Design a binder for this molecule. Structure first.
Ligand code: HEM
Ligand code: HEM
Ligand code: HEM
Ligand code: HEM
Lengths: 146, 141, 141, 146
């Protein structure tokens, strides 16, 4: 994706203070709570019947950490999101059968989480730069679907 | 909100479909799988080959449900109650996909109802499919 | 639909917004214009620069409507009647845009209510904004 | 976007049988009828009180010819849609203030019209090829928005 020098600095600077372990678990947990139908992909994760159940689920925290970690790698290759996520795109399509629309929902939930976590530091311009990033990652992950 | 005129256009248009409902339902599904490949992620257990019995059978089920809705256009919530629970609690199809199937159903009807697919009917059918989609995703959360 | 718990969550969260509602409305708009530039096509007559009193004034009106909606959560269609007519027949804002503003309102709320924005409240507010959006676009056709 | 040789041929072949002015007026008319909010840009076109009034409006027909003619000329440059519509994209954003969501709606209405027009000849594979084309055109027209 194309980011201005300003948008790039804003994104990277903010990410340096992100505890991927913590944020990843929060993002995936909220996705499963706010958009319940996304639970169809995690039947083997245990109890997800309540927000407290979902948020406390260790499997959810574990997976959330994996997802944000891979997301983290993309921030290091904003210039080539497509090639970066090619293998994971194929995996999500052929093996996991995940509707790419779910990538979009996760991107939006992640933004809400960053806002909740950072407060006033997550300014309109900073959010704008992040919306471009999550949209790019979502499109990169849906790129290999067929 | 379906207006009385809307309900008249839909009942007239669907009537003409008549006994081809299932066949048209199958065509609409095939159009969706080809045009919007991501919708295939919900049918990994199906033989999505052209003319497959699985697709023909599913197309007939989809059409019977739409027929049921047209018959009870004034009480769709109650008429599609079971299907609403099934899509919300079991299948859990992302709402975005209903718009894609609705579009493909519209294209199928257009290609088979030359005389009946007037702009007014086109408008009423689109509203109808949107209402059905709304009812089917009403219990998601 | 909004469950009693959903209603309780929304009233509690909004009660917390209180006298800042207007300021949050303006922030939400600013977030929308910067994040989703296409939404600016509906405000070519506005000065959209940061700090614009126009955006500020409009933000307070959006917030006041949301406040009115919360107060009449069990009768939104009637309470938002005039607003539905306006968006449907005068402004004619494509429905897709309501999802963009709803998201920006949620982000603004998250940034100002660390303690209250729990996952459960987050879910309830999203349901609430989706309901408001549905009411506001119900008379489009 | 990327069309296979066979996909290009199907689009081209079908298009050669299209009455551009006729289909143009039909598509724009149906757009204004099925999605009434799109009428917002055409207040100066006169009477749009009913479906017949819209379909029979000479201004609506004239604009439809204009729009479909540009779309038609774009089919010759399938491999460079963005470059082909760059200036029109700028125009629609800066001067006309047209929400790009309208391009997507027109794209779907156009597909319905081609189906009504060609019946059984508008096969599923042919539709799939056209869906790519209308999505590609809508994307190209929205590319310069800022
Ligand atoms: C957009 C950011 C996303 C990224 C970067 C991403 C990344 C990953 C990675 C790195 C894996 C691990 C694969 C392995 O270790 O073999 C994975 C697995 C998986 N992902 Fe994604 N993913 C994302 C979003 C999603 C979403 C939104 C869903 C569905 C709601 C999803 C569902 C899954 C599932 C079901 C697995 C397998 C988990 C298991 O083994 O039980 N992913 N993803
Ligand atoms: C016009 C809206 C729709 C109608 C009327 C409809 C109707 C139905 C019906 C009647 C069934 C079969 C019920 C049974 O056999 O007990 C069903 C199943 C199902 N639907 Fe839908 N559906 C609609 C939209 C969707 C969409 C948009 C998708 C996905 C892109 C979808 C995916 C499924 C799946 C995967 C099943 C189960 C198939 C199986 O494993 O047998 N449906 N639907
Ligand atoms: C939560 C959803 C929304 C609410 C509660 C809302 C509320 C309002 C209110 C109260 C007004 C002012 C009416 C008056 O001054 O008499 C209004 C005007 C307007 N709204 Fe919305 N609105 C919503 C979403 C939208 C969206 C998504 C857009 C477009 C991106 C939009 C565009 C406009 C425009 C252009 C005006 C006229 C402003 C002017 O020129 O003064 N609205 N809206
Ligand atoms: C395939 C999609 C489209 C194409 C290729 C396209 C093409 C054009 C062209 C070639 C013009 C004339 C430019 C000029 O005067 O120099 C134009 C004007 C315009 N377009 Fe688009 N357009 C498309 C879709 C739309 C849609 C969906 C709308 C709105 C619902 C729209 C609204 C307008 C308006 C309001 C004008 C100005 C007409 C006038 O001032 O006479 N266009 N478009």
């Amino acid at each position: 994706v194309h980011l201005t020098p300003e948008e790039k600095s804003a994104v990277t600077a903010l990410w340096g203070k992100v505890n991927v372990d913590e944020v990843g678990g929060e993002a995936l947990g909220r996705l499963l709570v706010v958009y319940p139908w996304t639970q169809r992909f995690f039947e083997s994760f245990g109890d997800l019947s309540t927000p407290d159940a979902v948020m406390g689920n260790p499997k959810v925290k574990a997976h959330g950490k994996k997802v944000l970690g891979a997301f983290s790698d993309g921030l290091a290759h904003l210039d080539n999101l497509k090639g970066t996520f090619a293998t994971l795109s194929e995996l999500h399509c052929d093996k996991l059968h995940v509707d790419p629309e779910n990538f979009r929902l996760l991107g939006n939930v992640l933004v809400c989480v960053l806002a909740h976590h950072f407060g006033k530091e997550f300014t309109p311009p900073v959010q704008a730069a992040y919306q471009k990033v999550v949209a790019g990652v979502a499109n990169a992950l849906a790129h290999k679907y067929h | 909100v379906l207006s009385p005129a809307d309900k008249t256009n839909v009942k007239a248009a669907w009537g003409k479909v008549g006994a081809h409902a299932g066949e048209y339902g199958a065509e609409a599904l095939e159009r969706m799988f080809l045009s919007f490949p991501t919708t295939k992620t919900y049918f990994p257990h199906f033989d999505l080959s052209h003319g497959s019995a699985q697709v023909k059978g599913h197309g007939k089920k989809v059409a019977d449900a739409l027929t049921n809705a047209v018959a009870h256009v004034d009480d769709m919530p109650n008429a599609l109650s079971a299907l609403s629970d099934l899509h919300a609690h079991k299948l859990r199809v992302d709402p975005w996909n209903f718009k894609l199937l609705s579009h493909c159903l519209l294209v199928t009807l257009a290609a088979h109802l030359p005389a009946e697919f007037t702009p007014a009917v086109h408008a009423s059918l689109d509203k109808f499919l949107a209402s059905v989609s709304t009812v089917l995703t009403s219990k998601y959360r």
